[PDB]
Amino acid sequence: HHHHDKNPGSENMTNTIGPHDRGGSSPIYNILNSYLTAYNGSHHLYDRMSFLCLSSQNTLNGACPSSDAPGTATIDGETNITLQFTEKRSLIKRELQIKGYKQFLFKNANCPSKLALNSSHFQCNREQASGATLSLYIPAGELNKLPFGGVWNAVLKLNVKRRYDTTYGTYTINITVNLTDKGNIQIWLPQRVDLNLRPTGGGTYIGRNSVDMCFYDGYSTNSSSLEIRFQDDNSKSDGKFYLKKINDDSKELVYTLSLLLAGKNLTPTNGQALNINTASSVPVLCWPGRLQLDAKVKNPEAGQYMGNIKITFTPSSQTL
Amino acid sequence: ANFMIYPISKDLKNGNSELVRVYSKSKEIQYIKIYTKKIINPGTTEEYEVDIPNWDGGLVVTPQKVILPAGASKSIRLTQFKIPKKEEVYRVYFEAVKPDLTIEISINIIYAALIRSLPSEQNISLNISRNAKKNIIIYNNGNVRAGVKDIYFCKSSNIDDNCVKKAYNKNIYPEKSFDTLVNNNFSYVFIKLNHGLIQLKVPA
Ligand code: NI
Ligand code: NI
Ligand code: NI
């Protein structure tokens, strides 16, 4: 229980939190761990430190009581702070809860009760305080309130005050939060398809269609690798996809697939598995992809044909 | 595709069980079937999967089928039946059931989560041997899988700058050996792993 002298004043700090994955529930995350705001051996002007928010309704810089607590009785507890977090690359904004409390310091006594930021002062064993500590933290489970992984940022401003007296400065705290979401992978076809089949020269036909798709894998991760498989039930171990006349298993027609996914192009056989290096609660934004179907058929019998294709999404084993 | 799953990967340890939730972004109610495959020879070129019943297989997955209301999520419970001596890896597929001249091609998305069934005390042991070609082989002695990134081949006990570096980024699973493909006769090796081990290299 040894403390150094210190005078309060404006401060600027940066606090980094995590990496924390989104998948597991957020634990408690410390922004300040009983940070010393003031202390003094000789006098007792730091016997009633209060910490006020700039606005009580404005969440930009944290919203919490902006005035000294009215009653003589202390408020034992924590102060709730609503603070606006902005993801860096999207500029999307979400408001999270922050918990804050002070703690008073006495020369000859130890009385460590937690007080709300604007709470009134007290004396321990009829002794006045000499300084105060300040703790601020993200509660458990708060980072799971964020809609998607990414670098979320915020700035907190608290005024440092002697209660019902002079304001000493303003603490600006820069809080960066690195959310991970590593187990997050999705695919969407924003919109079954028809190959719009038409004849060509020689009794040949040609059809071509394509589906646009939404595709995402959990980000701010390290480089990850995924596995995709394309299969047709009417898989004969050829590696070829087939369309059988409905009602006529005897007749088969052949078609092919190609996929451009986020700038990368591939044609898969029927049963092949493809690794995708990503270097090449879930999130809506998606890197673009397009599966394209194609077919060339000569002398084909009329009547409809149908084809079903399973596209399996998996992490692969030959990864890290 | 009208759904998604969280999560894509999970490790079950200590006999404890975890959950994989399935999300409906369709507004029309759907039915999901769940089934598991055990992965044989994982990390290798002869890797294959085979079906296991849901109760007497390494892992127990409940439920096997679900009603997926629109915009809601169900929960699927993964728990290890019996903790295993060495790591085991499974895939749990989430397919959907949709049954109630032209061409119609219905397109369908299936998710398979990669689940590691982990052993009780985790150890990693890497043994080196040399191949007929005299290439250097790495056997996973350790129960848990290896995950090597790069291998600094070395002329002598200390690395310096004359030692060859080749990056691999390939996992090594227990009881499996991996050929680095090198037949020249270096003395040691240094290995980094995903989150500096030094070992002698056999000249046989
Ligand atoms: Ni009162
Ligand atoms: Ni583009
Ligand atoms: Ni449920």
Numbering used by the authors:
A (entry chain C): 20 to 210, 216 to 304, 321 to 360
B (entry chain A): 0 to 99, 110 to 204, 212 to 220
Which passages does the manuscript contain on this structure?
Colonization factor antigen I (CFA/I) is a representative member of alternative chaperone-usher fimbriae in enterotoxigenic Escherichia coli, a major cause of travelers' diarrhea. For the CFA/I fimbriae, one subunit is the single-copy, tip-locating adhesin CfaE and the other is the major pilin CfaB, polymerizing to form the helical shaft of a CFA/I fimbria. In addition to the two structural subunits, biogenesis of CFA/I fimbriae requires the functions of two factors, the periplasmic chaperone CfaA and the outer membrane usher protein CfaC, which bear functional similarities to components required for fimbriae that are assembled by “the chaperone-usher” (CU) pathway. We demonstrate that the chaperone-tip adhesin complex CfaA-CfaE is essential in early fimbriae growth.
When compared to native CfaA, the mutant variant containing the triple residue substitution T112I/L114I/V116I on G1 strand (hitherto referred to as mtCfaA) formed significantly stabilized complexes with CfaE, CfaB and CfaBntd (the CfaB variant lacking the N-terminal donor strand). The structure was refined to 2.77Å resolution with Rwork of 22.5% and Rfree of 26.0%. In the structural model of the complex, the loops containing residues 100–109 in mtCfaA and residues 311–320 in CfaE were not built because of poor electron density in those regions. CfaA interacts with CfaE in the canonical DSC manner via a pair of parallel β-strands: one from the CfaA G1 strand and the other from the CfaE F2 strand. The differences in hydrophobic side chains of these residues in CfaE, especially for the residues F353 (M130 in CfaB) at P0 and Y20 (L221 in CfaB) at P5, lead to a shallower, narrower groove for binding to the CfaA G1 strand, which is consistent with weaker interactions between the adhesin and chaperone. The main-chain and side-chain oxygen atoms of CfaE S357 form hydrogen bonds with the essential cleft residue pair N180’/Y182’ and the conserved residue E46’ (residues from CfaA are marked with’), while Q358, T359, and L360 interact with T43’, N180’, and N203’ through main-chain and side-chain hydrogen bonds. Nearby the adhesin subunit C-terminus, residue R253 of the C2’ strand of CfaE interacts with residues E48’ and Y92’ from CfaA, contributing to anchorage of the subunit to the cleft region. Upon binding to CfaA, the dscCfaE has its two domains re-arranged with the joint angle measured at 161.4°.
